[PDB]
PDB file of C-alpha atoms in Angstrom:
ATOM      1  CA  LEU A 151     -10.171  72.602 -51.704  1.00 17.10           C
ATOM      2  CA  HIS A 152      -6.537  73.259 -50.502  1.00 16.39           C
ATOM      3  CA  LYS A 153      -3.147  71.072 -50.737  1.00 16.24           C
ATOM      4  CA  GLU A 154      -1.810  70.208 -47.264  1.00 16.91           C
ATOM      5  CA  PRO A 155       2.432  69.162 -46.630  1.00 16.84           C
ATOM      6  CA  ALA A 156       2.477  65.450 -45.918  1.00 18.73           C
ATOM      7  CA  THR A 157       6.060  63.638 -45.455  1.00 18.59           C
ATOM      8  CA  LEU A 158       5.606  59.561 -46.803  1.00 18.57           C
ATOM      9  CA  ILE A 159       5.561  57.230 -43.437  1.00 17.06           C
ATOM     10  CA  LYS A 160       5.046  53.714 -45.800  1.00 18.79           C
ATOM     11  CA  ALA A 161       3.367  52.659 -48.838  1.00 20.03           C
ATOM     12  CA  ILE A 162       0.956  50.132 -47.626  1.00 22.36           C
ATOM     13  CA  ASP A 163      -1.225  49.043 -50.892  1.00 18.97           C
ATOM     14  CA  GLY A 164      -2.191  50.261 -54.201  1.00 21.93           C
ATOM     15  CA  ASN A 165      -5.265  52.510 -52.486  1.00 22.49           C
ATOM     16  CA  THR A 166      -3.726  52.668 -49.048  1.00 23.93           C
ATOM     17  CA  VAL A 167      -0.611  54.825 -47.873  1.00 23.75           C
ATOM     18  CA  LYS A 168       1.044  56.070 -44.143  1.00 24.98           C
ATOM     19  CA  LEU A 169       1.877  59.833 -44.466  1.00 24.69           C
ATOM     20  CA  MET A 170       3.089  61.755 -41.497  1.00 20.28           C
ATOM     21  CA  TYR A 171       0.594  64.913 -41.064  1.00 17.67           C
ATOM     22  CA  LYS A 172       0.592  67.143 -39.314  1.00 16.37           C
ATOM     23  CA  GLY A 173       3.041  65.860 -37.096  1.00 12.87           C
ATOM     24  CA  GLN A 174       1.015  62.872 -36.900  1.00 12.70           C
ATOM     25  CA  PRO A 175       1.538  59.451 -38.590  1.00 13.59           C
ATOM     26  CA  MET A 176      -1.579  58.898 -40.614  1.00 14.84           C
ATOM     27  CA  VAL A 177      -3.027  55.817 -42.957  1.00 14.08           C
ATOM     28  CA  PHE A 178      -5.012  57.424 -46.038  1.00 15.30           C
ATOM     29  CA  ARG A 179      -7.041  55.466 -47.872  1.00 13.66           C
ATOM     30  CA  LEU A 180      -7.359  57.186 -51.782  1.00 15.81           C
ATOM     31  CA  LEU A 181     -10.716  58.860 -52.442  1.00 14.36           C
ATOM     32  CA  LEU A 182     -12.475  57.399 -55.001  1.00 14.20           C
ATOM     33  CA  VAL A 183     -10.281  54.699 -55.794  1.00 13.91           C
ATOM     34  CA  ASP A 184     -11.025  50.745 -56.255  1.00 14.29           C
ATOM     35  CA  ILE A 185      -8.954  48.104 -56.221  1.00 14.50           C
ATOM     36  CA  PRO A 186     -10.717  44.623 -57.127  1.00 15.83           C
ATOM     37  CA  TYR A 187      -3.528  43.355 -60.489  1.00 13.72           C
ATOM     38  CA  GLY A 188      -3.510  43.906 -57.192  1.00 10.83           C
ATOM     39  CA  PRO A 189       0.202  43.459 -56.258  1.00 12.82           C
ATOM     40  CA  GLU A 190       0.867  45.237 -59.765  1.00 10.31           C
ATOM     41  CA  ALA A 191      -1.366  48.172 -58.794  1.00 10.26           C
ATOM     42  CA  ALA A 192       0.119  47.916 -54.769  1.00  9.93           C
ATOM     43  CA  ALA A 193       4.044  48.311 -56.750  1.00 13.19           C
ATOM     44  CA  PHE A 194       2.822  51.285 -58.694  1.00 11.28           C
ATOM     45  CA  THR A 195       1.854  53.595 -55.997  1.00 13.55           C
ATOM     46  CA  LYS A 196       4.837  52.258 -53.505  1.00 15.89           C
ATOM     47  CA  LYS A 197       7.031  53.437 -56.758  1.00 15.24           C
ATOM     48  CA  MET A 198       5.054  56.553 -57.236  1.00 13.92           C
ATOM     49  CA  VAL A 199       5.244  57.899 -53.340  1.00 11.24           C
ATOM     50  CA  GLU A 200       8.544  56.392 -52.987  1.00 13.81           C
ATOM     51  CA  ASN A 201      10.284  58.721 -55.817  1.00 13.00           C
ATOM     52  CA  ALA A 202       8.246  61.797 -55.084  1.00 10.88           C
ATOM     53  CA  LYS A 203      10.038  65.019 -53.946  1.00 10.75           C
ATOM     54  CA  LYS A 204       6.328  66.515 -52.595  1.00 11.64           C
ATOM     55  CA  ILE A 205       3.484  64.495 -50.886  1.00 14.28           C
ATOM     56  CA  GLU A 206       0.342  66.385 -50.527  1.00 13.48           C
ATOM     57  CA  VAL A 207      -3.165  65.895 -49.209  1.00 13.15           C
ATOM     58  CA  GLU A 208      -6.125  67.051 -50.177  1.00 13.05           C
ATOM     59  CA  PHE A 209      -9.444  66.413 -48.004  1.00 13.27           C
ATOM     60  CA  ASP A 210     -12.604  66.769 -50.620  1.00 12.16           C
ATOM     61  CA  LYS A 211     -16.166  68.785 -48.893  1.00  9.72           C
ATOM     62  CA  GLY A 212     -17.184  65.845 -47.954  1.00  8.52           C
ATOM     63  CA  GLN A 213     -16.352  63.116 -44.588  1.00  8.97           C
ATOM     64  CA  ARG A 214     -12.743  63.254 -43.872  1.00  8.64           C
ATOM     65  CA  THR A 215     -11.574  59.527 -42.067  1.00  8.37           C
ATOM     66  CA  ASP A 216     -13.857  56.388 -42.578  1.00  8.84           C
ATOM     67  CA  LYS A 217     -14.941  53.976 -39.732  1.00 12.85           C
ATOM     68  CA  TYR A 218     -11.378  52.504 -39.556  1.00 15.18           C
ATOM     69  CA  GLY A 219      -9.979  55.659 -38.684  1.00 15.47           C
ATOM     70  CA  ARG A 220      -8.286  56.084 -41.984  1.00 13.96           C
ATOM     71  CA  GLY A 221      -8.107  59.791 -43.547  1.00 15.20           C
ATOM     72  CA  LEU A 222      -9.739  60.189 -46.956  1.00 16.50           C
ATOM     73  CA  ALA A 223      -8.037  62.158 -49.244  1.00 17.14           C
ATOM     74  CA  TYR A 224      -6.940  62.871 -52.360  1.00 16.03           C
ATOM     75  CA  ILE A 225      -3.100  62.151 -52.716  1.00 17.05           C
ATOM     76  CA  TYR A 226      -0.356  63.996 -54.659  1.00 16.22           C
ATOM     77  CA  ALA A 227       3.289  63.193 -55.328  1.00 18.48           C
ATOM     78  CA  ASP A 228       4.872  66.067 -57.106  1.00 17.44           C
ATOM     79  CA  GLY A 229       1.582  67.485 -58.052  1.00 20.15           C
ATOM     80  CA  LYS A 230      -0.072  64.303 -59.420  1.00 21.14           C
ATOM     81  CA  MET A 231      -2.883  62.569 -58.288  1.00 18.35           C
ATOM     82  CA  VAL A 232      -1.635  59.076 -57.669  1.00 19.30           C
ATOM     83  CA  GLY A 233      -5.245  57.829 -57.496  1.00 16.93           C
ATOM     84  CA  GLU A 234      -5.819  59.371 -61.220  1.00 17.74           C
ATOM     85  CA  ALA A 235      -2.319  57.607 -62.328  1.00 17.68           C
ATOM     86  CA  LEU A 236      -3.540  54.128 -61.285  1.00 14.50           C
ATOM     87  CA  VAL A 237      -6.906  54.305 -62.679  1.00 16.88           C
ATOM     88  CA  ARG A 238      -5.665  56.002 -66.046  1.00 15.79           C
ATOM     89  CA  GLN A 239      -2.943  52.821 -66.109  1.00 17.91           C
ATOM     90  CA  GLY A 240      -5.732  50.452 -65.871  1.00 14.82           C
ATOM     91  CA  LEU A 241      -4.280  49.781 -62.336  1.00 13.50           C
ATOM     92  CA  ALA A 242      -7.840  50.830 -60.364  1.00 14.51           C
ATOM     93  CA  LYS A 243     -11.536  51.033 -61.121  1.00 12.93           C
ATOM     94  CA  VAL A 244     -13.425  54.692 -59.858  1.00 10.83           C
ATOM     95  CA  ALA A 245     -15.193  53.728 -56.622  1.00 10.87           C
ATOM     96  CA  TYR A 246     -18.839  55.207 -55.702  1.00 10.69           C
ATOM     97  CA  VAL A 247     -18.854  58.567 -54.022  1.00  9.91           C
ATOM     98  CA  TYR A 248     -18.900  58.208 -50.234  1.00 10.69           C
ATOM     99  CA  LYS A 249     -20.832  60.987 -48.423  1.00 13.84           C
ATOM    100  CA  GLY A 250     -20.095  64.197 -50.849  1.00 11.43           C
ATOM    101  CA  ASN A 251     -16.430  63.531 -51.519  1.00 10.15           C
ATOM    102  CA  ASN A 252     -16.835  63.828 -55.327  1.00 11.38           C
ATOM    103  CA  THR A 253     -14.914  66.824 -56.417  1.00 12.93           C
ATOM    104  CA  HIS A 254     -12.527  64.605 -59.129  1.00 15.69           C
ATOM    105  CA  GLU A 255     -15.381  62.263 -59.881  1.00 14.59           C
ATOM    106  CA  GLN A 256     -15.605  63.220 -63.119  1.00 17.50           C
ATOM    107  CA  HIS A 257     -12.040  63.802 -63.939  1.00 15.68           C
ATOM    108  CA  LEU A 258     -11.314  59.885 -62.634  1.00 11.40           C
ATOM    109  CA  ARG A 259     -13.923  58.558 -64.758  1.00 13.33           C
ATOM    110  CA  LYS A 260     -12.696  60.038 -68.051  1.00 11.76           C
ATOM    111  CA  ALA A 261      -9.382  58.019 -66.719  1.00 11.91           C
ATOM    112  CA  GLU A 262     -10.596  55.490 -66.534  1.00 11.88           C
ATOM    113  CA  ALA A 263     -13.043  55.490 -69.877  1.00 12.79           C
ATOM    114  CA  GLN A 264      -9.690  56.007 -71.476  1.00 14.67           C
ATOM    115  CA  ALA A 265      -7.911  52.974 -69.695  1.00 13.78           C
ATOM    116  CA  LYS A 266     -11.257  50.987 -70.617  1.00  9.03           C
ATOM    117  CA  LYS A 267     -10.587  51.788 -74.398  1.00  8.96           C
ATOM    118  CA  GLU A 268      -7.241  50.925 -74.019  1.00  9.14           C
ATOM    119  CA  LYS A 269      -7.768  47.418 -72.644  1.00  8.56           C
ATOM    120  CA  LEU A 270      -4.954  48.291 -70.039  1.00  9.21           C
ATOM    121  CA  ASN A 271      -4.161  45.761 -67.613  1.00  7.42           C
ATOM    122  CA  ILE A 272      -7.637  45.281 -65.347  1.00  7.09           C
ATOM    123  CA  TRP A 273      -9.719  46.027 -68.820  1.00 10.73           C
ATOM    124  CA  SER A 274      -7.452  43.784 -70.420  1.00  9.56           C
TER     125      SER A 274
END
């Protein structure tokens, strides 16, 4: 998989962000991340992407857009995965694999177990 440059346009909520991607505005939905702490997840994602000096999009090997037109990707802010950071913080849960996009699933489930063990936020 490869990282591609993108520019933040707008933070929307915990797992949705509007990006300029290859010169077109596009809403992205973070792969493998579920939000059941909703506003807390929103605030965390907002700060992460707004403070980054570099935003990158990384499509998985599966379907790249959902039915609603949203890009389905991993988002990196300064080299760190936004979805993973949320899961690790106990601010989101790991979703079911959608259409073959499972490359970082294992890594996410680990982050999740650890947040769980630490009784963090939604695991409170």
